[PDB]
């Protein structure tokens with residue numbers, strides 16, 4: 001009942017952290033329109049959530065396209081009448097040294113991570129202002145450190161955090177809060193990275209003070225629920241570290 | 251519901267933010283031993299909480315006294331059998347320019363804020379280890395900026411945040427998380443500061459993006475509940491800004 005009566009939009013909601021956000025949000029009483037290009041995982045998640053009596057709607061959409069932001073907003077409004085929560089979770093990237101980077105690498109990272117964050121916030125702003133709602137964007141601890149091979153990934157992530165701080169200041173008068181989560185969780189995207197960079201991945205796992213890679217449902221999603229809920233109604237423009245204590249903000 | 255079955259120690263728990271934490275903790279199902287020198291407010295709070303069906307115990311103690319840590323730990327165990335949560339909330343200080351600072355100003359700030367935080371963490375460590383518990387310490391945004399007149403207040407606050415990060419690293423293997431809240435709330439200590447420094451207080455009020463000074467119960471305490479609860483079980487060593495967006499950690 002933490003999000004009872006609230007409507008949430010979750011991008012990349014068919015897998016990884018976005019799937020766990022969708023599951024826990026519905027479990028907390030929220031109506032969720034979750035968006036993904038993966039309709040195999042997307043339709044089965046819709047089937048599982050609606051079977052248990054939850055209100056979830058899958059929308060198959062590539063959020064990197066110009067018309068996706070308005071289609072996502074229109075689909076949430078048509079299905080649930082409003083938008084209280086916007087979780088900009090989806091992001092794709094490629095890892096390579098800076099001297100190895102290509103324009104396609106920046107296009108992927110900014111096109112799937114940064115610009116959908118901006119465009120969905122612009123499209124959903126009237127609905128979020130009506131709801132006095134909450135926007136949860138996603139950063140990364142490796143973008144804070146400057147982890148090697150993360151040129152295009154970290155550039156988009158820190159651009160996401162920058163616009164999150166600007167929007168927090170611009171939208172605070174409307175009662176809309178904007179915050180960032182930096183997670184570390186066992187997802188499909190992390191498993192592919194652990195296979196391509198096993199030494200770096202093992203060093204990252206061994207660094208976690210709490211001695212585990214996060215579970216998306218029990219370690220990451222409750223932090224997103226907190227930011228989407230009225231418990232954080234006096235918190236905006238912040239970055240929450242859901243990483244087992246790996247990086248401590250000062 | 252959220253802290254059902256948990257025992258909490260809350261210092262300065264009879265007034266201001268500490269009282270809001272004590273109230274809200276009991277509403278979430280926790281058993282609270284709250285400590286304060288204000289026995290008038292302390293006795294009435296205990297009467298109010300037990301009268302509403304809650305479990306709370308008031309301990310009258312000056313936490314700057316060197317035996318109070320063991321007296322507090324023993325009282326919590328004697329009343330409720332263990333310690334799952336430690337909230338180091340009490341802190342008294344005086345404001346003056348650096349060129350106007352006396353040793354008694356440093357003694358008050360360190361003696362009421364910093365050293366009780368260390369000693370209560372040491373005293374409660376066996377109970378927190380048994381519980382795999384959570385420690386919530388308190389900082390200040392004014393210490394982050396270095397606001398004038400805050401030499402002794404900021405020094406103790408940043409010393410608190412330092413030991414919080416050290417213990418988070420040292421205690422993470424035991425499953426004990428340690429985090430900091432930086433609040434901005436309408437309390438009696440803030441009211442006394444508003445009278446002594448009206449222009450600076452007006453400037454601090456006007457800076458808040460969310461355009462209000464925090465209500466202790468609805469704006470500050472739910473952030474403490476989040477850190478004390480299992481929703482933040484993957485978060486340690488962090489600082490949470492409950493300040494309406496005034497300061498954004500990067």
Ligand SMILES: NC(=O)c1ccc[n+]([C@@H]2O[C@H](COP(=O)([O-])OP(=O)(O)OC[C@H]3O[C@@H](n4cnc5c(N)ncnc54)[C@H](O)[C@@H]3O)[C@@H](O)[C@H]2O)c1
Pocket residue numbers: 011012013014015016017018035036037038061062063064088089090091092112138139140141182183184185186187188189190
């Ligand atoms: N998992 C981690 O440890 C970790 C670490 C740092 C940051 N993050 C951030 O957390 C968020 C979640 O990451 P994850 O590991 O769950 O990702 P993932 O790669 O495991 O899953 C991403 C999901 O988003 C969907 N998606 C990708 N591109 C899309 C597009 N253009 N349109 C619609 N849907 C699309 C995919 O189908 C997939 O379901 C990401 O923004 C990521 O940058 C995660």
Ligand SMILES: NC(=O)c1ccc[n+]([C@@H]2O[C@H](COP(=O)([O-])OP(=O)(O)OC[C@H]3O[C@@H](n4cnc5c(N)ncnc54)[C@H](O)[C@@H]3O)[C@@H](O)[C@H]2O)c1
Pocket residue numbers: 261262263264265266267268285286287288311312313314338339340341342362388389390391392432433434435436437438439440
């Ligand atoms: N209220 C704010 O805006 C604000 C801003 C920055 C930081 N903080 C921090 O938040 C915490 C709460 O502050 P507040 O505004 O509620 O303070 P306050 O002065 O309003 O309340 C302090 C409470 O602690 C008790 N106390 C003080 N010294 C004690 C001692 N030696 N032993 C036992 N009890 C003692 C007092 O009796 C009182 O009940 C403090 O640590 C403060 O530094 C608050």
Ligand SMILES: [Ca+2]
Pocket residue numbers: 063064065066069111115116117119
């Ligand atoms: Ca876009």
Ligand SMILES: [Ca+2]
Pocket residue numbers: 313314315316361365366369
């Ligand atoms: Ca002491």
